[PDB]
Amino acid sequence: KSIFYNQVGYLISGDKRFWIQAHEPQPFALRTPEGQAVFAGMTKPVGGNWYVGDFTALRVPGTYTLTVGTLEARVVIHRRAYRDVLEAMLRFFDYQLCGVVLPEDEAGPWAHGACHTSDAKVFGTERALACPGGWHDAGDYGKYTVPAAKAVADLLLAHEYFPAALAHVRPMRSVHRAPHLPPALEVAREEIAWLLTMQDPATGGVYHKVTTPSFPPLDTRPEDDDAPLVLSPISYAATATFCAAMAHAALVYRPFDPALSSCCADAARRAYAWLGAHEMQPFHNPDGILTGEYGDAELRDELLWASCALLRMTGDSAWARVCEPLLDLDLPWELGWADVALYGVMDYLRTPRAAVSDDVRNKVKSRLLRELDALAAMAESHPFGIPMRDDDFIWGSNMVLLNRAMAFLLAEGVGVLHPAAHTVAQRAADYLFGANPLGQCYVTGFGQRPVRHPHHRPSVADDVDHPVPGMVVGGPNRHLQDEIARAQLAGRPAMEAYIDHQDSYSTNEVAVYWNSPAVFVIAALLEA
Ligand SMILES: OC[C@H]1O[C@@H](O[C@H]2[C@H](O)[C@@H](O)[C@H](O[C@H]3[C@H](O)[C@@H](O)[C@H](O[C@H]4[C@H](O)[C@@H](O)[C@@H](O)O[C@@H]4CO)O[C@@H]3CO)O[C@@H]2CO)[C@H](O)[C@@H](O)[C@@H]1O
Ligand SMILES: OC[C@H]1O[C@@H](O)[C@H](O)[C@@H](O)[C@@H]1O
Numbered sequence: 001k002s003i004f005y006n007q008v009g010y011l012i013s014g015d016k017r018f019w020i021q022a023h024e025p026q027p028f029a030l031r032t033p034e035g036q037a038v039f040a041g042m043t044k045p046v047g048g049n050w051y052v053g054d055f056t057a058l059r060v061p062g063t064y065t066l067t068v069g070t071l072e073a074r075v076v077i078h079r080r081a082y083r084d085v086l087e088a089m090l091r092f093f094d095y096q097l098c099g100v101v102l103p104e105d106e107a108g109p110w111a112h113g114a115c116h117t118s119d120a121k122v123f124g125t126e127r128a129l130a131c132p133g134g135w136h137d138a139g140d141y142g143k144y145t146v147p148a149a150k151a152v153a154d155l156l157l158a159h160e161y162f163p164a165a166l167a168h169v170r171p172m173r174s175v176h177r178a179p180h181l182p183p184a185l186e187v188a189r190e191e192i193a194w195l196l197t198m199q200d201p202a203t204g205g206v207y208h209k210v211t212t213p214s215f216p217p218l219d220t221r222p223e224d225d226d227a228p229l230v231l232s233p234i235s236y237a238a239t240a241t242f243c244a245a246m247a248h249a250a251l252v253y254r255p256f257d258p259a260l261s262s263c264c265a266d267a268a269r270r271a272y273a274w275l276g277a278h279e280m281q282p283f284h285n286p287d288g289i290l291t292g293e294y295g296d297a298e299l300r301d302e303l304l305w306a307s308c309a310l311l312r313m314t315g316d317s318a319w320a321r322v323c324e325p326l327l328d329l330d331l332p333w334e335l336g337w338a339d340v341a342l343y344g345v346m347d348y349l350r351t352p353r354a355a356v357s358d359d360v361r362n363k364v365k366s367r368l369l370r371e372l373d374a375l376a377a378m379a380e381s382h383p384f385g386i387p388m389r390d391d392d393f394i395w396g397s398n399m400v401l402l403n404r405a406m407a408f409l410l411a412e413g414v415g416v417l418h419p420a421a422h423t424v425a426q427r428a429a430d431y432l433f434g435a436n437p438l439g440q441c442y443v444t445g446f447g448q449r450p451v452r453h454p455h456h457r458p459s460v461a462d463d464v465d466h467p468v469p470g471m472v473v474g475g476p477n478r479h480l481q482d483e484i485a486r487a488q489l490a491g492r493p494a495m496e497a498y499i500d501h502q503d504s505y506s507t508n509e510v511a512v513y514w515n516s517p518a519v520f521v522i523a524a525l526l527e528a
């Protein structure tokens with residue numbers, strides 16, 4: 001038996017909760033490290049077989065010993081408890097940089113020379129094309145347009161919403177250009193710059209991904225990976241998500257990098273022209289390409305996002321003719337990577353009210369509220385207070401969770417203020433940092449039970465026991481979609497369907513689009 005808690009820490013002014021498996025209320029105490037009790041209370045039932053202890057009213061910063069029954073845990077309370085972990089989570093993006101020297105003074109053990117520097121060949125042609133830069137998507141070295149757009153969107157949103165919190169962190173500053181932009185925008189620019197090179201100049205269409213034809217060994221260092229790079233065909237989804245992301249970037253970078261902003265604005269417009277002239281064809285891996293497909297049969301949510309993004313970028317009411325009918329569809333309103341309608345909803349809602357139909361706008365806001373109410377209900381019935389059900393624990397469940405937390409916080413910027421918003425955010429972070437049935441901190445390098453063996457090639461290649469820090473893992477996946485999970489996790493409840501093993505890619509991989517909602521949510525909490 002043990003105490004389950006936020007292993008990174010708690011905010012002075014934030015909610016403070018711990019969990020234990022018990023069958024009745026027990027007293028508990030928080031004590032200074034010399035041992036004197038500073039706070040005492042009683043645990044209370046929350047379902048399954050869980051009790052919780054609330055020590056929110058302890059406001060004095062320090063490292064305390066939580067004791068309950070015969071168990072003890074070490075809990076930290078601090079003004080900005082999540083500053084280190086947010087910085088690590090943002091630095092992950094720079095650790096993923098492709099085609100750039102990462103020096104040892106910035107990147108420590110994981111420093112390396114520029115990787116994947118060769119030109120990629122366009123699929124089914126002899127043509128070559130340079131598209132250097134950007135991020136290795138995940139545990140592999142491929143760069144995929146569709147998930148890249150979500151990661152960029154999320155970082156841009158975190159800058160718009162929580163610039164003060166983000167001002168307190170430092171990326172790998174010396175690998176980026178001077179004069180230095182604010183942290184989120186500095187980091188995001190490297191991906192935006194890469195995305196721009198994935199657009200076909202002749203048509204406006206965007207290539208779906210650039211990868212080697214297959215995955216290299218788990219042991220491969222990035223600079224050792226010398227297989228030819230292949231540009232997979234142009235896709236509707238890539239072109240639409242590129243459009244939306246570039247349109248978002250055009251607005252955000254206006255006062256920071258006017259050349260980039262103007263360049264993104266025009267690229268978004270050329271992408272949208274491509275969408276207008278082409279069919280909504282789902283992407284499938286071409287033959288001889290075995291890397292991540294990032295396919296998606298439903299493409300109207302991507303068009304929605306592209307259209308709403310351009311609406312807000314231009315402020316032209318003309319775009320609302322095409323947006324508002326897409327906003328009426330029964331699409332799921334989610335934050336990607338495949339179901340991206342809520343990004344579009346947010347662009348629509350953050351457009352000047354004069355540019356849109358007031359009728360439609362209030363209906364959109366009403367639906368957003370009903371959605372949040374539904375998520376809030378899930379959270380009430382869950383023992384750890386997270387907006388999740390057992391069936392939500394799929395591949396990348398940590399992202400499912402963080403996107404839901406993100407939705408509550410995004411809504412507060414568009415006049416939909418749900419009372420559960422900040423509780424949900426705190427519970428999400430608590431869960432991510434150890435307040436779960438496995439007592440598992442799902443970020444590398446933090447907490448008392450960190451992730452130690454992520455499915456991540458740079459980590460596997462150097463030290464298989466000490467990985468790159470600040471990486472958020474996929475989390476429990478009840479579908480057991482790799483050999484290690486099938487072997488070791490059959491019959492376990494959904495939230496326990498995780499294993500810290502380097503070969504469990506379906507529960508223990510990492511991704512730029514899993515760090516990006518975590519950056520947003522943790523930034524929100526830091527803005528205390
Ligand atoms: O199965 C029932 C359940 O499915 C839900 O959709 C899930 C789906 O189950 C799952 O297979 C899929 O997993 C994706 C994952 O989202 C994606 O992040 C991951 O990305 C890989 C990539 O393919 C690799 O190239 C690489 O670089 O690593 C990354 C990170 O692991 O790939 C897998 C498989 O392609 O996720 C779906 C969600 O989009 C349904 O939503 C639900 O309704 C069903 O009940
Ligand atoms: O199914 C996709 C998975 O395949 C594995 O072989 C790769 O190592 C992972 O990077 C990838 O997520």
Ligand SMILES: [Ca+2]
Pocket residue numbers: 296298299300301302338339340
């Ligand atoms: Ca879609």
Ligand SMILES: [Zn+2]
Pocket residue numbers: 097098099115116136141222
């Ligand atoms: Zn690379």
